[PDB]
């Protein structure tokens, strides 16, 4: 017969850019009438990501991200500012500063970061035989030099606890991963293929800065991926600095609740579409980690989600091989609703990675 309904509603729109550009407007609204798996509720969050090109000489882009949230009447905020550039095809360098505030507490930070992405292989046989390689195993090597002014009495207490803990306990290098990934974050590491290696602390030295003591943390870590992680396998594709010819913004935010979740997403960025050969462009392959991360939190209420997707191709373009097939097309834009598409929407809301690819050409 029937079951529990717990309906969920969601709309998605993709407005692509013409020519050879990979840009595209992405907005997604959603409403779920199911309790979230947050042990502290309500947990509201508002997110703003903005990137502007500093200079095309060596590919620095000015990226900022503001996470302002309230969880159980605790007003959380975390702002970052960073200048990230690809100095080569395998290594990324970032320098910037930010701050985090929770209730009364707040502390700023400035970080010099370098991320190096190594695939375990670069065999040409795979490249010339798999047109759409999804899984790509590799390692990311993070080297972070972050400086935090220890002005609050809690910051000095955190420093005193940490430097006393590192020298007194030899198991800090791996027990740091337990604190690092709080709650479900540690469990979500394995169900996404991530492996966090022991961090190497190159030294915790404190020195007086412009206004006082500045805790300096020079530490490296490397997280490995089974090809299941997007930050490793799709490392080049997630940083389209070469195709950023104008400022790109992504403003999102969710209103989590005791009996529901409300989601707004607004985006405008390059990399929405990639090539597939012979003038045939496709929407970018869906990132693996968000799907299989929401999956371990989105399988707690039986739901019959009704989702509508909107893809507005640029003038002169027509979709070829949309799978699942689009429900309707207004001669320039395509629309997905029900049928096999709603099944795929439930599939990916529960964590499935069923390939829903959209290819088009002029």
């Amino acid at each position: 017969g029937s079951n529990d309904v717990t309906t969920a509603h969601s709309d998605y729109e993709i407005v692509l850019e013409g020519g050879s550009s990979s840009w595209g407007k992405v907005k997604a609204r959603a409403k779920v009438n199911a309790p979230p798996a947050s042990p502290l509720l309500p947990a509201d969050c508002d997110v703003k990501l903005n990137v502007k090109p500093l200079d095309p000489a060596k590919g620095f882009v000015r990226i900022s991200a503001v996470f302002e949230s309230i969880v159980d009447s605790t007003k959380n905020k975390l702002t970052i500012e960073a200048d990230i550039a690809n100095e080569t095809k395998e290594r990324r360098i970032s320098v910037g500063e930010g701050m985090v505030s929770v209730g009364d507490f707040s502390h700023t930070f400035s970080f010099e970061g370098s991320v190096v992405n190594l695939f375990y292989y670069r065999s040409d046989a795979v490249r010339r035989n798999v047109p759409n390689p999804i899984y790509m195993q590799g390692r990311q090597f993070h080297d972070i030099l972050m400086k935090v002014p220890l002005d609050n009495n809690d910051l000095i207490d955190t420093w005193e606890g940490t430097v006393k803990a590192i020298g007194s306990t030899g198991a800090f290098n791996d027990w740091i991963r337990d604190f690092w990934f709080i709650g479900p974050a540690f469990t979500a590491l394995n169900e996404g293929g991530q492996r966090i290696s022991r961090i190497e602390v190159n030294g915790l030295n404190t020195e007086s800065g412009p206004k006082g003591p500045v805790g300096v943390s020079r530490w490296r870590f490397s997280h490995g991926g089974s090809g299941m992680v997007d930050s490793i396998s799709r490392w080049a594709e997630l940083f389209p600095s070469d195709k950023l010819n104008r400022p790109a913004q992504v403003e999102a935010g969710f209103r989590s609740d005791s009996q529901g979740i409300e989601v707004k997403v607004d985006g405008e960025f390059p990399g929405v579409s990639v090539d597939a050969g012979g003038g045939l462009r496709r929407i970018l392959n869906h990132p693996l980690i968000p799907l299989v991360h929401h999956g371990m939190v989105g399988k707690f209420n039986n739901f019959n989600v009704d989702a509508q997707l909107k893809v507005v191709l640029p003038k002169g373009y027509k979709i070829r091989y949309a799978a699942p097939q689009y429900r309707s097309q207004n001669l320039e834009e395509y629309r997905w609703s029900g049928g096999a598409y709603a099944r795929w929407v439930e599939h990916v809301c529960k964590g499935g990675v069923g390939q829903f690819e959209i290819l088009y050409a002029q």
Binding site: D11, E13, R29, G253, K264, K310
Partner: protein, 102 residues
């Protein structure tokens, strides 16, 4: 007892709903006038010498202006028995069904 209750003669509008819940055997709550009552000149007070810490005035959840406070035994000052969770809010409008944003 502890956790004295008090009345702020700065939010109080003198409605006396706090006085309605105060036990008649202890006239802890009263009235001061100092002028016309058409201009809020009928504030209420809590006689801390007579108050026996009933919680009746505060736990009744009727003070409309948040003048009853119930300072906790250590230092904590309440304002109302339970307070909503201070949520971030936005208007959820869909893309091309139900709503169309724009």
């Amino acid at each position: 007892a502890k956790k004295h209750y008090f009345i702020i003669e700065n939010l109080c509008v003198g409605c006396g709903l706090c006085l309605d819940k105060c036990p008649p055997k202890v006239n802890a709550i009263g009235y001061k006038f100092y002028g016309d009552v058409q201009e809020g000149g009928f504030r209420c007070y809590i006689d801390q010498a007579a108050c026996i810490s009933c919680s009746a005035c505060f736990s009744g959840d009727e003070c409309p202006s948040g003048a009853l406070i119930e300072v906790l035994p250590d230092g904590e000052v309440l304002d109302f028995s339970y307070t909503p969770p201070e949520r971030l809010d936005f208007d959820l409008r869909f893309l091309h069904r139900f709503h169309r944003e724009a």
